[PDB]
Write a protein that binds this ligand. Sequence first.
Ligand SMILES: Cc1cc2nc3c(=O)[nH]c(=O)nc-3n(C[C@H](O)[C@H](O)[C@H](O)COP(=O)(O)OP(=O)(O)OC[C@H]3O[C@@H](n4cnc5c(N)ncnc54)[C@H](O)[C@@H]3O)c2cc1C
Ligand SMILES: Cc1cc2nc3c(=O)[nH]c(=O)nc-3n(C[C@H](O)[C@H](O)[C@H](O)COP(=O)(O)OP(=O)(O)OC[C@H]3O[C@@H](n4cnc5c(N)ncnc54)[C@H](O)[C@@H]3O)c2cc1C
Ligand SMILES: *S/C=C/C[S@](=O)CC=C
Ligand SMILES: *S/C=C/C[S@](=O)CC=C
Ligand SMILES: [Cl-]
Ligand SMILES: [Cl-]
Lengths: 461, 461
Amino acid sequence: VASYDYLVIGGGSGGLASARRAAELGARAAVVESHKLGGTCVNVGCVPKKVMWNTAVHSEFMHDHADYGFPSCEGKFNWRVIKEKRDAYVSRLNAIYQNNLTKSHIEIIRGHAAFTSDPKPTIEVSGKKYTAPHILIATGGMPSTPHESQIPGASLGITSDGFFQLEELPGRSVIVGAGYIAVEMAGILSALGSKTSLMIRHDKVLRSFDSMISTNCTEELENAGVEVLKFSQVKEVKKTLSGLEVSMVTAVPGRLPVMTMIPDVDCLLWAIGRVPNTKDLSLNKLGIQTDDKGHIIVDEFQNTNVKGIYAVGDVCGKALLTPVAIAAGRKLAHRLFEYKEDSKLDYNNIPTVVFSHPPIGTVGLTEDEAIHKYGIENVKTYSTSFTPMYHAVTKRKTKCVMKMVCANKEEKVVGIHMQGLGCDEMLQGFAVAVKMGATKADFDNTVAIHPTSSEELVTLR
Amino acid sequence: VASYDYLVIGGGSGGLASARRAAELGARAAVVESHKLGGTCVNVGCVPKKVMWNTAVHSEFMHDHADYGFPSCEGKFNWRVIKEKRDAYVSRLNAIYQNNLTKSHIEIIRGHAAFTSDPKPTIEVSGKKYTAPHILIATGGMPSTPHESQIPGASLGITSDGFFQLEELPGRSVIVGAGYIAVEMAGILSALGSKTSLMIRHDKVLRSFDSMISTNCTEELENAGVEVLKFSQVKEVKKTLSGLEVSMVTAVPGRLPVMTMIPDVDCLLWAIGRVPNTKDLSLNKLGIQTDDKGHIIVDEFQNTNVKGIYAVGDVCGKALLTPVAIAAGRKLAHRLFEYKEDSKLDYNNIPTVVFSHPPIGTVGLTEDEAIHKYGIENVKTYSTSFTPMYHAVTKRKTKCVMKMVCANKEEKVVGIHMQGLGCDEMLQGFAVAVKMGATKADFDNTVAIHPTSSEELVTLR
Ligand SMILES: Cc1cc2nc3c(=O)[nH]c(=O)nc-3n(C[C@H](O)[C@H](O)[C@H](O)COP(=O)(O)OP(=O)(O)OC[C@H]3O[C@@H](n4cnc5c(N)ncnc54)[C@H](O)[C@@H]3O)c2cc1C
Ligand SMILES: Cc1cc2nc3c(=O)[nH]c(=O)nc-3n(C[C@H](O)[C@H](O)[C@H](O)COP(=O)(O)OP(=O)(O)OC[C@H]3O[C@@H](n4cnc5c(N)ncnc54)[C@H](O)[C@@H]3O)c2cc1C
Ligand SMILES: *S/C=C/C[S@](=O)CC=C
Ligand SMILES: *S/C=C/C[S@](=O)CC=C
Ligand SMILES: [Cl-]
Ligand SMILES: [Cl-]
């Protein structure tokens, strides 16, 4: 049984972040990884996603070309070529991580950890046993897919994981789901020239976001030529000669339910949520607490109910983002090995960008959440809608919408929400301000930068 | 002699801003304008500039096309087409302004104001006389050009003004000057396919900027294929059969001065500074104070030395930016007609974007200014340099460089400086933070947005 100061299960965002910091602070650390280093962000997530989003915006700028005085240009996307480059960049990052771990003398253990029934907390991998005083569970999540028992043929669909093994551009795609992953996939696929539908259970996408964003994003998807199938659900999927055929019910409000069939579908993509990676960890051997969906229960310090065992990141099911996983992993390593006992992540005012077309930036409270929290009379919103000057000379149009949610007499800025060109690089600075408790006065007394989109957030009236 | 509450000379950025606010506050206002409404920003400045910069970045993305899996595409820019669209958009804005002034019952007086020798402060235009209790001078500036007595042939060159009358793409351009206007013009012209040189008196451009930016921008101009002619000065310009021919001295440090000739030059562009528009105002009739270059002298409230006469914007020669002109004009209208006696513009931490390739964002103090102000031991800088993920799959590379200048034990952020993709929409939020007195801790405890360029400013070590 080999011994460390710090055993980390999972070499993704949270695990690597925490292993590294602990090594810096002088711990003897090991990372267990069953697949590739870098986890979801590197391999099947934020990094390959961004490369494909960059590609997709190349597609949109191809369209605007002739408008900008350039040769009317032309057509055909080669998926193979960018797929190869994207793979090679991911592999590059895998090696960068293995090499940085090794330079820091963090041991890599290759394989699938489970906990044993030993009384000391102890894992085993290809069954050698391993233990530390401090074990971090950082095993992330995976996509959920329907069971065949609910929807016959469900396993003919792929997930976002399979999206990154796609070797050619699907001629015709149906994406199921209404969250940020579904929206992003639909936008990439349609931009590059797949005939895309997005199938959602209600009338709008991103329904947990501020209703301005929810509404505007549903519109901009339609405008970009994504077919949004509202109030619709897959009932089953069949293999045919010419691809998949998808049965849906559409059940619009105050009309009769109608069953239709989508033929000729090359890619059916389930984006209906993620489940945590805990089923195979033998958690019940130690009585580690989960909820009904198998998230690990932690306190504000990332403690499980079992002393000396911790969890960060997707596996806990709160704020499912790479930088959250990282910051929580780093804070925890400061607590354990620098004995900074008040080291913890604040989960408030965490900013998000959704990489739609155009991208969404959001931080803080929706106008709804603010009203519930402050009461209707203590909430003031300011908002705006304009066409970026980029589009002054193009036929194609997108909007920029911005919204500031303000609280109380001093008008503390408790929420910013936007979708527009450039809003992906816009948000970080404003989220700094919002974490400081900036009030609208603070915004109004910053001099504007002209001409930009961003200057509108400091000139709202 | 016709009478108003508020007479404004100049219908550009500052003038229109101040006229409008005063009307809102219930004054009877008139604007005198000799050319077109909207002034320099609308007509020969920030708006046409931005449209051409947008065009230029279309050129750069054409290059990256084949890298992103798209048909190798191809060539030929049609200047005529975007020039027409750009003109029509400017004219559109002219009409928008005339119409908003009229809706607000602000009188437009068309023609050239000068002051008279009347004892009451009084102007005349096509000589009708006009007066108010309150006169705003907002006449802006114009480009300077060399005299024929210093450089024979100087009047064969154009200025930035003439740049916007260009009907075709100059085959071969020589830009003279080293400030932001020169850099921007060189970058637009080269991107669109002019063989461009930029002629500068020393070794780097933007020498008033933080030395990281100065250095990196000089490099990125070279990399984008702008020929930077260092330590060089025009001695004269001649018309030939095949265009202009430009004589320069190059006088590099510790080498012999060498005279060379640049033949075949279609466009010589002077960008060596701006002079204020005061020569024709008959200021001396009222004893209004200027400096040796004819800027109008004001206090922190925009008062001249003559009671009831004010000046905002470029004509005062401080912070030559549209949003500064606007904010000062608006603050002043609040002082005069809302009797808010402490209404004034803070000229500190005014942010600037320079629209090079890639763009520059800067706010606050250079590492130099900070050292002079805080002493060397109380200044800490953090900086970084990376290649944006955009470029992970392209042959072409640009850098992103970022720099945070920090002061004192708490490490107040007193300076941010960057050049990179997206840095034009990045800056506004961070400048809000900087105006609040944000410290590096405030930055470090904002959660990052991944994957973006902007997240690097909150993860510096
Ligand atoms: C399609 C998609 C796009 C996304 N886009 C973004 C984005 O743009 N921005 C953003 O911030 N977030 C994004 N995310 C979320 C981000 O990927 C995750 O929030 C982040 O990776 C969470 O890190 P983690 O440490 O929890 O888990 P992970 O990164 O999943 O890592 C867990 C690791 O544990 C390994 N592992 C699992 N169980 C075991 C075991 N028993 N033994 C050994 N090894 C094991 C796994 O193989 C894996 O490498 C995206 C997610 C997806 C799926
Ligand atoms: C090439 C270029 C690009 C620029 N790019 C940017 C940028 O991207 N961002 C930015 O913020 N700043 C930019 N600027 C600066 C910005 O254009 C000016 O700072 C801004 O217009 C200042 O406004 P103003 O009110 O002082 O003067 P102006 O806008 O010049 O307006 C003065 C007005 O007075 C009129 N006038 C003059 N004298 C008289 C008279 N005697 N009687 C009647 N009418 C008269 C003029 O015709 C004019 O319309 C740029 C400037 C240039 C030249
Ligand atoms: S997917 C990104 C991972 C980078 S590490 O988790 C941060 C510390 C090295
Ligand atoms: S060039 C931009 C001018 C807009 S106005 O000066 C601001 C108030 C209407
Ligand atoms: Cl690996
Ligand atoms: Cl006009």
